[PDB]
A paper describes a structure:
Fructose-1,6-bisphosphatase (FBPase) is a gluconeogenic enzyme that catalyzes the transformation of fructose 1,6-bisphosphate (F16BP) to fructose 6-phosphate (F6P) and phosphate. The gluconeogenic pathway of Leishmania converts metabolites into sugar phosphates to be used in the pentose phosphate pathway for synthesis of mannogen and glycoconjugates, which are essential for amastigote replication and virulence. Three crystal structures of LmFBPase have been determined: an apoenzyme structure that is in an unligated state, a structure bound with its catalytic product, and a structure in its allosterically inhibited form. The monomer core structure of LmFBPase has an α/β/α/β/α “club sandwich” topology, with two mixed β-sheets flanked by α-helices on both sides.
The overall conformation is very similar to the apoenzyme structure, with an RMSD value of only 1.0 Å (based on Cα atoms). This structure also adopts a planar topology, which has no significant rotational movement of domains as analyzed by Dyndom. The dynamic loop (residues 52–71) was found to adopt an engaged conformation, in contrast to the apoenzyme structure where the dynamic loop was found to be disordered in two of the chains. The dynamic loop of LmFBPase was found to be stabilized in an engaged conformation in the presence of inorganic phosphate and manganese. The catalytic product Pi is found in the active site, surrounded by two (or possibly three) manganese atoms. Indeed, three electron density peaks were found in each active site of this LmFBPase/Mn/Pi structure; anomalous difference maps calculated from data collected at 1.89 Å (the absorption edge for Mn) showed clear peaks consistent with manganese ions at metal sites I and II. The electron density at site III is only slightly less than the electron density for the two manganese ions; however, there is no observable anomalous signal for site III, making potassium the more likely candidate. Similar coordination geometries around Mn-I and Mn-II are found in the LmFBPase crystal structures with Mn–O distances close to 2.2 Å.
Author numbering:
A (entry chain A): 8 to 59, 64 to 336
B (entry chain B): 8 to 58, 70 to 337
C (entry chain D): 7 to 21, 26 to 57, 71 to 142, 156 to 337
D (entry chain C): 7 to 21, 25 to 60, 63 to 337
Write the structure that this text describes.
């Protein structure tokens, strides 16, 4: 009898709790398993490539299927009032009799331009809980509510990695725990409890193809990692934010998506990429900052808002930020 | 009723052919499936190290078991073993197989892709291998250009098996419901040009000046913008290189002055696949496949990929 | 291509304890199915160990569910109480693995559960049962259940480890010419039942087909879907019967009744029988309402 | 760690690789069919096609899919010259130069009226080897060749059981060995080596719903099994010939499909049901007879020929035949 994610969560909540968070995490699990199913057989089911979004991404077929899955299960869960997907312009409101307390923002498939080459991909979600009195009855209401939220209010966050094994990592503000899908029983089993990101590790992750378009201070930082006399650094960039962040959490290191001469506001989205990953990184003992301190302290102005990121081992991030100053 | 790897191979061989190669590819398929099984559940079965090198051992055990019982092999050489192994007499076919049973094994704990690589030579016309001595003598008079088949498997979100027999490259995908590899990527053709480079830039300082120059050009040139990708799994990175185009480099180091990658069971198989897909695959002095094999764990640097991207790279090497 | 799961179905059915309970049951069933499929290679066959493993699974997941106060297994003499801070409202009685001497021959097996609710438990009636269900472990894996508003059947999708709705509103036909009984025991039956069986074979009007897998869950599942009758009659040895009331006959009776069939023992409805003792027994005559009527007509002369 | 596969077992068993390739094609077919059965409920493949085969069976959708599978893989194997399916009127010839030495007759899905109720089903095959200096170039040639064959010429036979586990049992004239599908690796693993059917066991398997239509001697035999003072019998009838025969081989007992007042020639087909099962039962140490002695000694007149069967533990079958001769 191994320990399932569901059991783990039931245990985590107080004696005879509400149960909404358990139902939510069921919906997420089912979605993740559906997506995993589709990815593993995509080649034979004709779902490789692209269709013939609000961020200007041309969509892979698995983006659409992923989004459909997440929405279907989350809305039927009875635990969500609002959902916001990368693949949708607008937020979606759950129907009145079927409306829980959670606002969930998700990237249903991260790295979708990796799938054709069997490089890892993932899903990311951040969960906020509807503020005490308030009631969201429309898209207008929801847009007003998100504007008065911060990453520091996020109650839970997590990602899934679709690779040789299927991982589901999550936090509820009391550390990070990692699970692995047992395909023989379709349950997520606790395999990586109390994930602690090392304080220092000589691994950096960034797209150096963009060297030319970076700020001078960041070119300097990267050059130092390569040219300094003291400590040798190793470079790794899978090109899947989830894949790279997962390696960062387990091995230590740093992961960067810096300011660009094109994307002067950044590549990564705040609500459904950067802030969830920031809560996970912080809870694992790491540091997660953007252009002006903590990602989680940034004010949310709009659903598809962007930010650069510098995430990872506390001291590696400190070194990086020392060049900025 | 989809097209299996097995049926594809049966069709590929001549009318009423011998059958050795079919049996070999069965053994390889079974091995790959056993390894895949173990990787997918490694976390729950204690084979990961959380709190490094058990899957190497299990992989090696699998490949050996199935290949030796296949009756198609005379000699095997694994990355995990110092010496070559001889198949027992009368369980002894015509193939010499050199394999990396698990490539990227320090990736597994982080769920980063890994693979298996194999190169197949066929015992020369008048030769008979009866011992380790014999085998060491035989490999010394072989080249990558004599390789009859090569392939790799990628263990990721899907499980791929890519291979060639000197008539192009074809890619298969494991259907886990029936445990057969299904043709999904027929006639893989690597683009002639594509702006993606793959190398560990952490080692910048230890590279030769010409290669530092090449990398700097990819970043600073006015004409064409390059994207950087380095998974750190040779199979993962090469597979992306074959399908997307680009370049993959493991250049000469100030430490590893002979190179990181092994010739027999990493560089030469991947070279035959890259060449068959329409790409170019070179080391320190031309084609990897034209290099003479001196020793089982011999090494070489590599510059592999899109023919024009490799040409560009080699243009910088001109002193 | 996002199918309807058992979990969603149940969430929709309610206006959370029962949802958590049905999670625990699902996980248990999947664990048991996993073990059965590979039992031959993992040494768990004879040639039962799977009774023990099954029981362990059900207990583990049901107790951690926080929805149970009491559980009773066929494999245990005594009932088990859930710990105080982890104690829901449900009493559950289950046969974690039915037909365990079938496994070595790859004949179907199943799991059966009956759920009562508490508002000491000296007597219950099947008519108070709030839910019941079984799983069938065969070439597909089925999970059939009721909550007093009909019967619905689900099938395990092994690719996602969820039970998918495949057989909604199972209705057992009123009449169907299939009978299920061990005729090896002919000699030990009561005269009226010998007469009934002889009539099924010798009557001029309607031809009957015989099927007996020898797994109660397998045979009852075929009975619900195809129609027919399933009998474990009184024996000259087992004068009180073979099947157990609390964790076999009464759950199956609620399912059969909710599907539109009839489910009786030696003296009327199984569900109306008083429960005196945990491992109490009863004969059964279950199935299509008219086939059971025909059977009972022979008993009454 | 690295278990013994069916493929390895077969490679070991041979001294030419034609039989190995054949058994690959069969394995793949069996795995494809298993795949389909496990998910049939969600893929809409439960029940029947809306519009009967050569023996008058209305077909289940899984009959058609199964038949397609077996044909596809067996023909691409390069080991077959002729194939005969239950689901086809005519035999099929493999294309010239994709043409091996084996004639294979198969029931691609046995018990297809069990699937909707999740009761076990199976596949059955019998393998003959083309006679010395015979050459099959058409359906005419094939029909001529089968007429001069017997079950005693069968080189191999086997079945698959699709249940909670997936079994594949086979013989090549040197006993019976049983395998089990490992779904994690899609290989059949040796689990039941040297299957030996007990000489005596008190279990009988027959559809007693047909009592009224049986011959008097067989009614007498069945009544004896129930009413005799000496030994008590247990009755089991799954209603899937493969399921019931598999239980018979492992537990012992008897399995009967006797002569009927309707089917006076019998229900079971000789080429792809009775004769393969007969070779397996004989190789396991049992006895397998029809209306006039050994099934395997019967002359094959036609592809969809029928026969009754009395199969199982040698002494149980002897007892049965004693009632016929009295
Ligand atoms: K995107
Ligand atoms: K190494
Ligand atoms: K039991
Ligand atoms: K049929
Ligand atoms: Mn996305
Ligand atoms: Mn993304
Ligand atoms: Mn390796
Ligand atoms: Mn028991
Ligand atoms: Mn029982
Ligand atoms: Mn049949």
């Amino acid at each position: 009898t191994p320990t399932t994610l569901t059991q783990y969560i039931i245990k985590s909540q107080p004696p005879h709790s509400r149960g909404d968070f358990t139902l939510l995490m069921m919906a997420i699990q089912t979605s993740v398993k559906v997506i995993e199913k589709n990815i593993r057989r995509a080649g034979m089911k004709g779902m490789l490539g692209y269709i013939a979004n609000a961020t200007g991404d041309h969509q892979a077929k698995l983006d659409v299927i992923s989004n459909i899955a997440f929405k279907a299960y989350l809305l039927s869960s009875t635990s969500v009032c609002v959902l916001g997907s990368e693949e949708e312009e607008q937020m979606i409101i759950a129907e009145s009799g079927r409306r829980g307390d959670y606002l969930i923002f998700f990237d249903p498939l991260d790295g979708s331009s990796n799938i054709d080459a069997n490089v890892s991909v993932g899903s990311i979600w951040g969960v906020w809980r509807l503020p005490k009195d308030t009631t969201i009855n429309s898209v207008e209401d929801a847009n007003a509510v998100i504007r008065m939220l911060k990453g520091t209010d996020m109650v839970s966050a997590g990602y899934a990695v679709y690779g040789s094994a299927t991982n589901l990592v999550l936090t509820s503000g009391h550390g990070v725990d990692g699970f692995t899908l047992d395909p023989n029983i379709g349950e997520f089993i606790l395999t990586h409890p109390h994930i602690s990101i090392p304080k220092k590790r000589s691994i950096y992750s960034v797209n150096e193809g963009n060297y030319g378009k970076w700020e001078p201070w960041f070119k300097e930082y990267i050059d130092y990692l390569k040219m300094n006399k003291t400590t040798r650094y190793s470079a790794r960039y899978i090109g899947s934010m989830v894949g790279d962040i997962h390696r960062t959490l387990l091995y230590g290191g740093i992961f960067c998506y810096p300011k660009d001469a094109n994307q002067v506001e950044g590549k990564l989205r705040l609500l459904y990429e950067a802030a969830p990953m920031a809560m996970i990184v912080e809870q694992a003992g790491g540091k997660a900052v953007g252009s002006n301190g903590r990602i989680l302290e940034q004010s949310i102005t709009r659903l598809h808002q962007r930010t650069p990121v510098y995430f990872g081992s506390r001291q590696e991030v400190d070194l990086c930020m020392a060049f900025r100053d």
